Amino acid sequence: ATIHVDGKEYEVNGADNLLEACLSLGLDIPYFCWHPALGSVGACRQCAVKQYQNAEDTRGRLVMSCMTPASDGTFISIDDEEAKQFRESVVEWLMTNHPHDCPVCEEGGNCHLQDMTVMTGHSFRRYRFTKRTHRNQDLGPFISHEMNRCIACYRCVRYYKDYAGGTDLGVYGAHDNVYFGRPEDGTLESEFSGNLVEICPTGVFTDKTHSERYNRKWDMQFAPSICQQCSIGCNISPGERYGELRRIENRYNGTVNHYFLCDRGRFGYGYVNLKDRPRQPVQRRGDDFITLNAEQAMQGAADILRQSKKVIGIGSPRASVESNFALRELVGEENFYTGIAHGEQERLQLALKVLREGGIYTPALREIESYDAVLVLGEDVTQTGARVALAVRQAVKGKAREMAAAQKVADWQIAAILNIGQRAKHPLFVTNVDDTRLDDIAAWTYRAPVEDQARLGFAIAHALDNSAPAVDGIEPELQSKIDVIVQALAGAKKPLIISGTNAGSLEVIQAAANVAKALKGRGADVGITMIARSVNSMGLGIMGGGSLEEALTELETGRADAVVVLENDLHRHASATRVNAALAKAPLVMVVDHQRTAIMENAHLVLSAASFAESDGTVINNEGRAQRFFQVYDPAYYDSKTVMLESWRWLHSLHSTLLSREVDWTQLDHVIDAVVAKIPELAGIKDAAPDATFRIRGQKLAREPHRYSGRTAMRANISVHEPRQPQDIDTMFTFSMEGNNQPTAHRSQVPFAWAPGWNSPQAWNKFQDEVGGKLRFGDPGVRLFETSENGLDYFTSVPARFQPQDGKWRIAPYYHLFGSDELSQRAPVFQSRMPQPYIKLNPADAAKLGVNAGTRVSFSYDGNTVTLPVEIAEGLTAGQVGLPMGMSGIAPVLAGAHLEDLKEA
Amino acid sequence: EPAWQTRDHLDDPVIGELRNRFGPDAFTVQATRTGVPVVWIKREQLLEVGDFLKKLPKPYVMLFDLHGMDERLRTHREGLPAADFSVFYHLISIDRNRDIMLKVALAENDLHVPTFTKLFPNANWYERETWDLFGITFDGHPNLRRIMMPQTWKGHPLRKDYPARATEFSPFELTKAKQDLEMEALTFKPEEWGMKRNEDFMFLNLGPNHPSAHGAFRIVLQLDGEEIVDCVPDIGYHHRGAEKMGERQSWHSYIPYTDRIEYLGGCVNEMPYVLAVEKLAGITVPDRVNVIRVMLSELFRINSHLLYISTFIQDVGAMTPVFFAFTDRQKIYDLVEAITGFRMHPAWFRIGGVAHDLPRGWDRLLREFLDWMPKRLASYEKAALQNTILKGRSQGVAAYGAKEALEWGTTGAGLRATGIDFDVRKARPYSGYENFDFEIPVGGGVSDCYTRVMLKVEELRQSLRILEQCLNNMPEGPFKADHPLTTPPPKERTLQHIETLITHFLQVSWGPVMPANESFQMIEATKGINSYYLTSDGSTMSYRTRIRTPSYAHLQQIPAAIRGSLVSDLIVYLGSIDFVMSDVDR
Amino acid sequence: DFLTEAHLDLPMEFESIGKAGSRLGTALAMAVDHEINMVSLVRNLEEFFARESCGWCTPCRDGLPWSVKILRALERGEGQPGDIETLEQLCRFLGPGKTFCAHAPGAVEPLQSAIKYFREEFEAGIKQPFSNTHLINGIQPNLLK
Ligand code: SF4
Ligand code: SF4
Numbered sequence A: 001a002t003i004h005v006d007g008k009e010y011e012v013n014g015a016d017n018l019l020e021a022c023l024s025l026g027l028d029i030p031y032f033c034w035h036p037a038l039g040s041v042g043a044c045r046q047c048a049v050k051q052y053q054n055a056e057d058t059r060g061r062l063v064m065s066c067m068t069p070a071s072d073g074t075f076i077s078i079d080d081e082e083a084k085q086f087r088e089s090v091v092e093w094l095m096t097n098h099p100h101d102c103p104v105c106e107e108g109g110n111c112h113l114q115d116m117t118v119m120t121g122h123s124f125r126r127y128r129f130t131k132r133t134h135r136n137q138d139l140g141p142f143i144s145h146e147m148n149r150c151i152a153c154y155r156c157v158r159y160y161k162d163y164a165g166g167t168d169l170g171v172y173g174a175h176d177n178v179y180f181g182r183p184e185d186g187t188l189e190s191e192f193s194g195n196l197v198e199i200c201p202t203g204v205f206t207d208k209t210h211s212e213r214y215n216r217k218w219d220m221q222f223a224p225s226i227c228q229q230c231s232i233g234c235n236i237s238p239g240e241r242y243g244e245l246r247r248i249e250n251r252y253n254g255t256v257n258h259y260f261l262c263d264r265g266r267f268g269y270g271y272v273n274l275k276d277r278p279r280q281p282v283q284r285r286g287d288d289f290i291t292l293n294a295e296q297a298m299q300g301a302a303d304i305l306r307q308s309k310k311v312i313g314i315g316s317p318r319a320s321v322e323s324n325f326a327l328r329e330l331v332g333e334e335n336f337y338t339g340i341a342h343g344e345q346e347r348l349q350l351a352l353k354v355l356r357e358g359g360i361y362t363p364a365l366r367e368i369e370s371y372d373a374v375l376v377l378g379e380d381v382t383q384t385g386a387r388v389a390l391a392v393r394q395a396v397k398g399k400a401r402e403m404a405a406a407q408k409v410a411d412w413q414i415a416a417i418l419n420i421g422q423r424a425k426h427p428l429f430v431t432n433v434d435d436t437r438l439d440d441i442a443a444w445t446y447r448a449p450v451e452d453q454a455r456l457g458f459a460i461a462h463a464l465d466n467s468a469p470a471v472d473g474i475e476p477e478l479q480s481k482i483d484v485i486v487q488a489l490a491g492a493k494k495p496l497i498i499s500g501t502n503a504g505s506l507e508v509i510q511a512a513a514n515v516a517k518a519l520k521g522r523g524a525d526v527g528i529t530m531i532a533r534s535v536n537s538m539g540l541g542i543m544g545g546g547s548l549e550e551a552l553t554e555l556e557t558g559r560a561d562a563v564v565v566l567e568n569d570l571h572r573h574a575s576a577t578r579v580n581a582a583l584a585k586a587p588l589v590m591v592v593d594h595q596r597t598a599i600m601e602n603a604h605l606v607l608s609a610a611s612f613a614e615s616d617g618t619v620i621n622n623e624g625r626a627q628r629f630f631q632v633y634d635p636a637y638y639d640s641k642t643v644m645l646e647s648w649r650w651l652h653s654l655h656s657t658l659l660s661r662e663v664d665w666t667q668l669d670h671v672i673d674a675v676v677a678k679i680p681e682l683a684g685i686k687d688a689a690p691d692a693t694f695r696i697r698g699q700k701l702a703r704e705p706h707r708y709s710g711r712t713a714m715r716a717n718i719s720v721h722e723p724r725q726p727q728d729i730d731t732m733f734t735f736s737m738e739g740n741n742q743p744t745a746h747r748s749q750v751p752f753a754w755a756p757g758w759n760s761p762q763a764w765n766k767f768q769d770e771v772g773g774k775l776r777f778g779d780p781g782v783r784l785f786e787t788s789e790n791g792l793d794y795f796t797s798v799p800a801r802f803q804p805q806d807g808k809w810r811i812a813p814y815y816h817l818f819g820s821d822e823l824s825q826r827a828p829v830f831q832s833r834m835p836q837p838y839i840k841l842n843p844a845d846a847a848k849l850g851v852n853a854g855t856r857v858s859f860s861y862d863g864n865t866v867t868l869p870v871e872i873a874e875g876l877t878a879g880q881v882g883l884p885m886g887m888s889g890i891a892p893v894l895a896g897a898h899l900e901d902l903k904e905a
Numbered sequence B: 001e002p003a004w005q006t007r008d009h010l011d012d013p014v015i016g017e018l019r020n021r022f023g024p025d026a027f028t029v030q031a032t033r034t035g036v037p038v039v040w041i042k043r044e045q046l047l048e049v050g051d052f053l054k055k056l057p058k059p060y061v062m063l064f065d066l067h068g069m070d071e072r073l074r075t076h077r078e079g080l081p082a083a084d085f086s087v088f089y090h091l092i093s094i095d096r097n098r099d100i101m102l103k104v105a106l107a108e109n110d111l112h113v114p115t116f117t118k119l120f121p122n123a124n125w126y127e128r129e130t131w132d133l134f135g136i137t138f139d140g141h142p143n144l145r146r147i148m149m150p151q152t153w154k155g156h157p158l159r160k161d162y163p164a165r166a167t168e169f170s171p172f173e174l175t176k177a178k179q180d181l182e183m184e185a186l187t188f189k190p191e192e193w194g195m196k197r198n199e200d201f202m203f204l205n206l207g208p209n210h211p212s213a214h215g216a217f218r219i220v221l222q223l224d225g226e227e228i229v230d231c232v233p234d235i236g237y238h239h240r241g242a243e244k245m246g247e248r249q250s251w252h253s254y255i256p257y258t259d260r261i262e263y264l265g266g267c268v269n270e271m272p273y274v275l276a277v278e279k280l281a282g283i284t285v286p287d288r289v290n291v292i293r294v295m296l297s298e299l300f301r302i303n304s305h306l307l308y309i310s311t312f313i314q315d316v317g318a319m320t321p322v323f324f325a326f327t328d329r330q331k332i333y334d335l336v337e338a339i340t341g342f343r344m345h346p347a348w349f350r351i352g353g354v355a356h357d358l359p360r361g362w363d364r365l366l367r368e369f370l371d372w373m374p375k376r377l378a379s380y381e382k383a384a385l386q387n388t389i390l391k392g393r394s395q396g397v398a399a400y401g402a403k404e405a406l407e408w409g410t411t412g413a414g415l416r417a418t419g420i421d422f423d424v425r426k427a428r429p430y431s432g433y434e435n436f437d438f439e440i441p442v443g444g445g446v447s448d449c450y451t452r453v454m455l456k457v458e459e460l461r462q463s464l465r466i467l468e469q470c471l472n473n474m475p476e477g478p479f480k481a482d483h484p485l486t487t488p489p490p491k492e493r494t495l496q497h498i499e500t501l502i503t504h505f506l507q508v509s510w511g512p513v514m515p516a517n518e519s520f521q522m523i524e525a526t527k528g529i530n531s532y533y534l535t536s537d538g539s540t541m542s543y544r545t546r547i548r549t550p551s552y553a554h555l556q557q558i559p560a561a562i563r564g565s566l567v568s569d570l571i572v573y574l575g576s577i578d579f580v581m582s583d584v585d586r
Numbered sequence C: 001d002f003l004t005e006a007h008l009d010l011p012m013e014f015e016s017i018g019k020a021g022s023r024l025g026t027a028l029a030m031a032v033d034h035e036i037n038m039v040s041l042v043r044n045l046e047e048f049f050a051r052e053s054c055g056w057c058t059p060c061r062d063g064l065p066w067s068v069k070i071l072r073a074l075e076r077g078e079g080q081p082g083d084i085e086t087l088e089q090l091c092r093f094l095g096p097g098k099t100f101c102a103h104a105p106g107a108v109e110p111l112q113s114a115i116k117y118f119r120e121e122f123e124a125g126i127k128q129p130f131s132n133t134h135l136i137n138g139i140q141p142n143l144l145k
């Protein structure tokens, strides 16, 4: 398609509207109510241009560039006098009721309305009358509400209802008294409600967790990082001021997590700012806790490790690839144990075998939205992999998208698309032990135990392909539902099967693999997605090693007299009493961690490791994509006594001091090269990000904006002399503003989006090749493995049906986005959002036990009696008791286990 | 058509002459807001174009400026030849009252240009600075050594990949070995500086500590007895990195740094920068703004000229007029403090106007100064300036004609004492200087020390006349333009209107967004012609800030004019130039 | 749009009333006598149109109340200079294609027809000088001439 903007010819896409096409060309058109992820509605009337019928036309007519397709031979003008006057008039009309609030507004300096007021050239007020006002609502602990600043652009309601699928936010009222919020005061119930702080172009919805310790955008030190709160691996921009992690912003990755994060990643960063974190190496000597610096810590640790007869290392899926590899090199490959349980490791290795050996393509997070039917087996996606649930919602709305496409309606005209596809949607079949948050859009939901969900998957795979093993004992109603699922999956051009290791069942993963293989054998374009547990679960599975139980037996038998635990609390993967006894028996325990865990009391040496905000490294997400996260700030810049290093730095220096009695720390690229050389399965992490010698025309990449302030006063209370700027020898970024952050710079890692005239998160449009697409020079991250040429065989281990045995209670896992993650519960802002710890019971089981809803019952697990209140779960199958996984005192390894003497306290 | 409009200047006769001489495809005409024809010339034709411009019927006789630009980070290079670096040559024809900017594009690896010193001798120091700050080598230079930074310096400071701030570098540690090594570097060696040495040529060191108000600097002197056979000035001891700070500060926040370029000039130094930024922004200031800026420029011009005359008289040997001239400076300082709130660096001019309105009672203080000044000036003349000992120390000392002033880029009183009537306020009028009735004094043809001092006295009297006209006719109106890019907006509308608050919020935090263009403004400063050449890449910071100062030209003209004279003649010549080392180094 | 006595001899067709600068509409004409002030009538019309906006799109929702407040100021004689220019710009920028639907063009048709035909009644409301800012002590204002 050929367009002519202000007499200049451009080649665009005819399927795009004029606004996104002109923004992709670098032209500036003001806009409020259009979003690339949400489509065009024509509400704010800000994107007006002047369209001409032909080339020799002078009058023209004001059209809206978001509502006008960028067809071939189009003639428009942006800098026309009438279009400029109308855009300034629209800004003026929006400014008639706006409060004089910019100094006391958290959106100041980050405001789209500020940028568009300046861009339209409106700086003189002639409106002399009153301004309308609105009371505010309490929207919970994460979102702060201020309705006076609203411009009625309907972005919040469109995102929250059409895109996110939420129900409790809406628009109320009339002509100029439109109110946007909840019908009553209460917490916003959506798991993706935190994206409202970037969706809203004004300061109506603001980050309250950031608003506590608020600082402006220009004062932030930003980094490109990966969110560590689950396995999806969404790209984030952590921003820091005065030595504390101030905010998490969404970093655009067109392949993974383009515009949106979930609430756990956006608000669960508060564990970094905890005051109980280790900041210096501490050595235990009797009842004394001697604080050392790094050199004598390495010397002492080297002597005690050299005096030991066998040293073992227990890793974690929390730690990066480099840190786990450094521990594995320090203790040896045969003495390296993964920090997860045997069942967790078996499920994770089976998921990895399915992903990189099953011959079925694993889609990216953005690619999930283009699938025609979704079957979720066992995995509570909204509570474990929430962004996959959001992409599943988009894939479900794909049917309305294609129905509107069949009527020659453009893909950006979202209102007509939703009008045509009223309630028709792509098939979604979710299985769980109880209700999920995807039940409102699911074609079917199966509330059953994990054995029954696995049997349903095996029956689906057998009905799709008769070479798969059959299931005997299917009820006719269950057979009818299986036939419905099979008829939906067989007629889908792009079926998608989503499972994971959080269900606590190997057979669920086997059934999902069988369904994917049966769909692949029919020639369908089937994709499979496995949801892991932690941020680097896939990387720890690829690296491999023994389980935690083998390490505990090695400690208990006396064969290992020294244990090095890397960033693992060890209570989430095994029983606490066994771990405590095995660690107390060992004469040397060294815990390398950034959080104050419970096993540090028995630890002889504690190494103050760095979190993701203070370290660089590589993490492998659930799809096998290696992603590099970069250090945000130097911990020792403010507190000069703080000795907090990277975990791989700690362990590599320890290995060097053990081998040659000299302290060499590392460079990060050396550890990357060591990983690539020693582990050929992790050889793709070299190309995840360029090395520390990468420059943009000779200069580094800036972590903080060019208008960063306070440089001669941030440390003036400690010392009036300005200290040395922190040097970054590990990566290509610099701890200063003397770098490159141009939108046209040839790079893939963007610490933050800023353009002249675009201070809001809309500068990502300037940082993309086309608006709403990918990054201009490719998205960061590289897939570790390609799709295999040949697949697996059918798993013939069909489990027997769930039999409720008397006196034993099967623990059904319940996951919560706020509470199940290990580090997110440590964030103090989560405790208001974290649920109370209950236990779920069937009505029949509660009536048999004589217990009501809310009464306290006590159960003993591994000789430990604990009491919890009771809810009555209607969808939970009898013979099962429902436990919330990852909570205080409930380890995630309890999923799929059994319970004894569960009785009323 | 407004004066800030983008023009290609294809109607200039020099463009047609170059078309008829070198051909249409030989060069590229660039449309800028500089007001000058910008011609991108190929490198191998640069000396041919220079010869052709030097041999025109009305020739381009003065190399106004010569410097470089790092074009690697420049994104908006539409209509421009492909370049990693560029070298620009600003040349002035006074007979036509026109000027032209030649530009030579350079790749990153082939950073060599033919030297321009065979056509203009000021290209020596200009190319030495261009090599020092950008690494561009000039083939055929007599000595291409560093002129701003020490010889033991690594890297070129004005490149875009060079870190600007000292906090980026390690803090300054002075050890014994470091002190010895840097003291060895400052030692003078006859062979390295191109002295080209008789068993009697002794060597003399003047600085670098300097007992005068105009900076600290060195002159190394080759002496036959008392006669100066050769000399080369050593500068760079006062280098503040002001252009690198221009690339480091926003448009609004750079104005205090523009103040300290010529620290005896103040608002005179602020004027060309804000005029060039207003050209970039498309801002035409109202008439009251123009009259206020003219009034403050003339006040600071009288201050600078008073200090210059007092310092010259003190350097001759009479020490009382410095006391009285600093009392008159205190009267000027009273008025300037009342208007702006500061004495020497007011930083009071703004993009689109001035920081505040004139306070109530400014006319009273201007009346006291206008009544005070002329009797004091007449007493200065009768007590010291007509003294025959001062005349013997000054008349005929370091004299040059129109050709030597033109070939060395000398401007101000040194140029006008050669008889050349070239003042910026009358040739290329700016800031409403065409509405003021004043005369431009000129000399007889010879630029003595005494002739320059008497000319500066005459411009002091003419500035008093301009101040009287400003006092009698000051318009009633706004002190700031009504443009959306007026930085900052008027304060009360910021304090009670949300759109004005938004404009102020974004203009003082992120900075105002100048659209990507090039602008240029030259003004008649207190010491000559001062110019700002500002390249904007569409951001809130300057992509390139080039500050041309006349003191650079005068310090470069010193060895040609003081050769064959005495050391006391050199002291008198230094006292009669009206320079400062911040102007030289900046 | 309002029409005068000279337009009374016009056939009630779409093309005939359209060529006079008005619309045939529902063809139910409403007659205004000499006792009715045009400013009060247009204020009533714009108050109806401003309170019956659906709130979707910016120009109607945020410019009809501005016209209502300007007409209220003109009704009590508190009008300031530039009010009628603001009303004319509100007419021009709320026409067809500028708003999401046709409610606001029909809103601004009576306002522009009354400004065109009965401007002397709108001139009578402008009595006070224009004042948007109050004095702030210690800051000299920008006296825009
Ligand atoms: S939302 Fe934007 S325009 Fe409104 S008060 Fe906040 S910063 Fe100012
Ligand atoms: S609250 Fe924000 S996103 Fe919602 S309509 Fe108002 S300005 Fe738009």
Ligand code: SF4
Binding pocket: A227, A228, A229, A230, A231, A232, A233, A234, A261, A262, A263, A264, A265, A266, A385, A386, A387, A388
């Ligand atoms: S889905 Fe997972 S990786 Fe993404 S923001 Fe949420 S917790 Fe972080």
Ligand code: SF4
Binding pocket: C052, C053, C054, C055, C056, C057, C058, C060, C061, C099, C100, C101, C102, C103, C104
């Ligand atoms: S013009 Fe129509 S769509 Fe726009 S706010 Fe008014 S009634 Fe609603």
Ligand code: FES
Binding pocket: A019, A030, A031, A032, A033, A034, A041, A042, A043, A044, A045, A046, A047, A048, A064, A065, A066, A067
């Ligand atoms: S962006 Fe087009 S009308 Fe809102």
Ligand SMILES: [Ca+2]
Binding pocket: A615, A616, A631, A728, A729, A730, A731
């Ligand atoms: Ca580091």
